[PDB]
Scaffold this active site. Structure first.
Site, PDB file in Angstrom:
ATOM      1  N   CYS A  38      49.424   8.459  28.560  1.00 13.40           N
ATOM      2  CA  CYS A  38      49.944   8.533  27.235  1.00 13.40           C
ATOM      3  C   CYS A  38      49.294   9.615  26.249  1.00 13.40           C
ATOM      4  O   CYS A  38      48.022   9.803  26.795  1.00 13.40           O
ATOM      5  CB  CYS A  38      50.133   7.193  26.469  1.00 13.40           C
ATOM      6  SG  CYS A  38      51.618   6.116  27.182  1.00 13.40           S
TER       7      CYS A  38
ATOM      8  N   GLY B 215      47.551   5.063  31.277  1.00 13.47           N
ATOM      9  CA  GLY B 215      46.484   6.246  31.133  1.00 13.47           C
ATOM     10  C   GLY B 215      47.165   7.634  30.681  1.00 13.47           C
ATOM     11  O   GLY B 215      46.297   8.554  30.328  1.00 13.47           O
TER      12      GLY B 215
ATOM     13  N   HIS C 187      50.173   4.403  19.493  1.00  8.86           N
ATOM     14  CA  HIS C 187      49.940   3.088  20.073  1.00  8.86           C
ATOM     15  C   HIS C 187      48.377   2.878  20.716  1.00  8.86           C
ATOM     16  O   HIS C 187      48.199   1.657  20.986  1.00  8.86           O
ATOM     17  CB  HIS C 187      51.062   2.543  21.171  1.00  8.86           C
ATOM     18  CG  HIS C 187      51.200   3.565  22.216  1.00  8.86           C
ATOM     19  ND1 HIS C 187      50.426   3.456  23.380  1.00  8.86           N
ATOM     20  CD2 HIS C 187      52.343   4.024  22.713  1.00  8.86           C
ATOM     21  CE1 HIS C 187      50.628   4.175  24.284  1.00  8.86           C
ATOM     22  NE2 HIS C 187      51.961   4.931  24.057  1.00  8.86           N
TER      23      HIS C 187
HETATM   24  C1  LIG Z   1      50.718   5.080  28.127  1.00  2.51           C
HETATM   25  C2  LIG Z   1      49.890   4.319  27.765  1.00  2.51           C
HETATM   26  N1  LIG Z   1      48.395   4.509  27.647  1.00  2.51           N
HETATM   27  O1  LIG Z   1      48.196   5.707  28.470  1.00  2.51           O
HETATM   28  O2  LIG Z   1      47.526   4.020  27.259  1.00  2.51           O
HETATM   29  C3  LIG Z   1      51.944   4.095  28.803  1.00  2.51           C
HETATM   30  C4  LIG Z   1      52.797   4.968  29.712  1.00  2.51           C
HETATM   31  C5  LIG Z   1      52.829   4.652  31.079  1.00  2.51           C
HETATM   32  C6  LIG Z   1      52.755   3.203  31.707  1.00  2.51           C
HETATM   33  C7  LIG Z   1      53.135   3.524  33.072  1.00  2.51           C
HETATM   34  N2  LIG Z   1      54.221   4.382  32.831  1.00  2.51           N
HETATM   35  C8  LIG Z   1      54.240   5.059  31.844  1.00  2.51           C
HETATM   36  O3  LIG Z   1      54.692   6.177  31.533  1.00  2.51           O
HETATM   37  N3  LIG Z   1      52.721   3.462  27.822  1.00  2.51           N
HETATM   38  C9  LIG Z   1      52.840   2.210  27.699  1.00  2.51           C
HETATM   39  O4  LIG Z   1      52.164   1.651  28.602  1.00  2.51           O
HETATM   40  C10 LIG Z   1      53.868   1.675  26.649  1.00  2.51           C
HETATM   41  C11 LIG Z   1      53.090   1.111  25.281  1.00  2.51           C
HETATM   42  C12 LIG Z   1      53.909   0.713  24.216  1.00  2.51           C
HETATM   43  C13 LIG Z   1      53.106   0.158  23.086  1.00  2.51           C
HETATM   44  C14 LIG Z   1      55.041   1.818  23.913  1.00  2.51           C
HETATM   45  N4  LIG Z   1      54.548   0.511  27.326  1.00  2.51           N
HETATM   46  C15 LIG Z   1      55.467   0.662  28.228  1.00  2.51           C
HETATM   47  O5  LIG Z   1      55.714   1.884  28.779  1.00  2.51           O
HETATM   48  O6  LIG Z   1      55.882  -0.204  28.853  1.00  2.51           O
HETATM   49  C16 LIG Z   1      56.346  -0.016  30.261  1.00  2.51           C
HETATM   50  C17 LIG Z   1      55.489  -0.039  31.391  1.00  2.51           C
HETATM   51  C18 LIG Z   1      54.136  -0.430  31.249  1.00  2.51           C
HETATM   52  C19 LIG Z   1      53.257  -0.309  32.655  1.00  2.51           C
HETATM   53  C20 LIG Z   1      53.646  -0.078  33.772  1.00  2.51           C
HETATM   54  C21 LIG Z   1      55.071   0.379  33.924  1.00  2.51           C
HETATM   55  C22 LIG Z   1      55.857   0.208  32.649  1.00  2.51           C
END
Ligand SMILES: *[C@@H](C[N+](=O)[O-])[C@H](C[C@H]1CCNC1=O)NC(=O)[C@H](CC(C)C)NC(=O)OCc1ccccc1
Ligand SMILES: *[C@@H](C[N+](=O)[O-])[C@H](C[C@H]1CCNC1=O)NC(=O)[C@H](CC(C)C)NC(=O)OCc1ccccc1
Lengths: 306, 306
Positions: free
Chosen positions: A145, A143, A41
């Protein structure tokens, strides 16, 4: 003596973390030999997220589109492929700090250490269990991931987890390092709910043995139970069934303490039916389920790595 | 989101751990530049332990008496001195993995990471607080002495703790890296009891702000209190007095959440007087006191090191 939620030393993994940026998104990668592994992603934008078409998105990317940095050193990308939900970025430099390693798919109930990273820089390390519903209860922000989960056995790092997402309930989901999700989750911002979670019975029993080894024995009662009678109580309190395999895994702790596993089961039954009446066990006012039998033996025997 | 007891990444410290043996005793040392720091009780035997005369014991030792190994590499000792309760072993090789570092004496209520080591090899990493009575609640077995406590700030390791002993109550005591004990403890197997411990009030308040930031807000009530009225309740429950300095340190968390520190104090007062009635906060059925305000902001903002 004493008993703490202990993570593995993180140094072997810290040497493998990099920053991967494609467009505006920056996240973490794992740099082993001449390959960087990161969540696919990284190639999405804000409004791809509902149902991204990852194959079409990747076809539009060349090697220079991926900016990979290990500290303040740029790593040049010389090839890219997708495997399930992970990208594999071939780079021109092999990581000189590559440890001995393995990719493993862990089973629910097992534990691992998470190295939480931002911008390819470590933030902290903590111990997690793969819950029976294939989520983890972590600490992850935007950030994070591509942060990974691992166990160490002697000199070998077993990578088992790469962080992808947070479910609307606040629990966390991710993949093995082959990019297969744990559980029925997808790397889309869609409707997807975790299964009802259950308590990991074998882990609770392991932690009660840990309590006995460390001198906290107030909960030991004088009774015994059958495995079938115990499991009727476990079911009612949303605990997993205890199997003969689990009884056998608890054999070393049973031997060390002189307490038969079914005698410990009778003490756990009383704790479930009666509560702790304001009493703590190893400083906790709840029954702890994120220590495996092997975690307890490691900590209580002082197992080191390399 | 989520909130976990997170340790610092340990890689910078793992590179400094060695094995020190004098006679039959083997324990850990810290190898920085051309000096190895380790507890002076490495030079005792079984029946020196009641009242060892460390100066007489050391006078009988030459450099070859100390066997220091960094992995499978022997380090040759070319000088020794004693500083308070630590030995400083000058070696012929400077550690090429020496991080940027500082020796700090931490205050009660502050937190650090412990890297638990045996035979100079890391076993695990966990987060500890210096308790108000100058003990720590760790996990240490025979062979763990010379394990260290540290904080990381950007690229700099602040060493604050070196492990020496376990009190008959099962809590742990040690020195700063100048070899001064925290608290009124001595490196002798004598009668020495820890002071009555108290709960770190500012940390409990920090953790309640962490709970609010992560969506656990059931305990917020509609009331306020004065600082003097709060402290009368704190005293009764064996909590430390909250000072204006502590109120000020909680300012950033207060601002982020919109909850005045004295409004949070009124919620804590109700939790102390009424209990949690079977409710958890951030998965705990007790009030947690081993997170500093700075720990909460670090974790909730994703502060990385280097
Ligand atoms: C990682 C993405 N990154 O680092 O660029 C991120 C994981 C985070 C968000 C906050 N808590 C986590 O565990 N993953 C995502 O944002 C993910 C992306 C999709 C294409 C899979 N979506 C997601 O987790 O949605 C829920 C969320 C987003 C932001 C804040 C809280 C929950
Ligand atoms: C470290 C010594 N070493 O590694 O060689 C050891 C610390 C351990 C023992 C078990 N729990 C700990 O924290 N320290 C000592 O053994 C210490 C030596 C004195 C000269 C200071 N004495 C001590 O801690 O006595 C208590 C004790 C000993 C053994 C088991 C349980 C408690």
């Amino acid at each position: 003596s004493g008993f703490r939620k202990m993570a593995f030393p993180s140094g072997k993994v810290e040497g493998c973390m990099v920053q991967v940026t494609c467009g505006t998104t920056t996240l973490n990668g794992l740099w082993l030999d001449d390959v960087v592994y990161c969540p696919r992603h990284v190639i999405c934008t804000s409004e791809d997220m509902l149902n991204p078409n990852y194959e079409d998105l990747l076809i539009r990317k060349s090697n220079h589109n991926f900016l990979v940095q290990a500290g303040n050193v740029q790593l040049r990308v010389i090839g890219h492929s997708m495997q399930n939900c992970v990208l594999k970025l071939k780079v021109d430099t092999a990581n000189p700090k590559t440890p001995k390693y393995k990719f493993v798919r862990i089973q629910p109930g097992q534990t691992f250490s998470v190295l939480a990273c931002y911008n390819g820089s470590p933030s902290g390390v903590y111990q997690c269990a793969m819950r029976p519903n294939f989520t983890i209860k972590g600490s992850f922000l935007n950030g994070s991931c591509g942060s990974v989960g691992f166990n160490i056995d002697y000199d070998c790092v077993s990578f088992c987890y790469m962080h992808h997402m947070e479910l609307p309930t606040g629990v966390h989901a991710g993949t093995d390092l082959e990019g297969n999700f744990y559980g029925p989750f997808v790397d889309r911002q869609t409707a997807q709910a975790a299964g009802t979670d259950t308590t990991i019975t074998v882990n609770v029993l392991a932690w009660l043995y840990a309590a006995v080894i460390n001198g906290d024995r107030w909960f030991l009662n004088r009774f015994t139970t059958t495995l079938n009678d115990f499991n009727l109580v476990a079911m009612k309190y949303n605990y997993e069934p205890l199997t003969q395999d689990h009884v056998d895994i608890l054999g070393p702790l049973s031997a060390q303490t002189g307490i038969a596993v079914l005698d410990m089961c009778a003490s756990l039954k009383e704790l479930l039916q009666n509560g702790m009446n304001g009493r703590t066990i190893l400083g906790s006012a709840l029954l702890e389920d994120e220590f495996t039998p092997f975690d307890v033996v490691r900590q209580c025997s002082g197992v080191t790595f390399q």
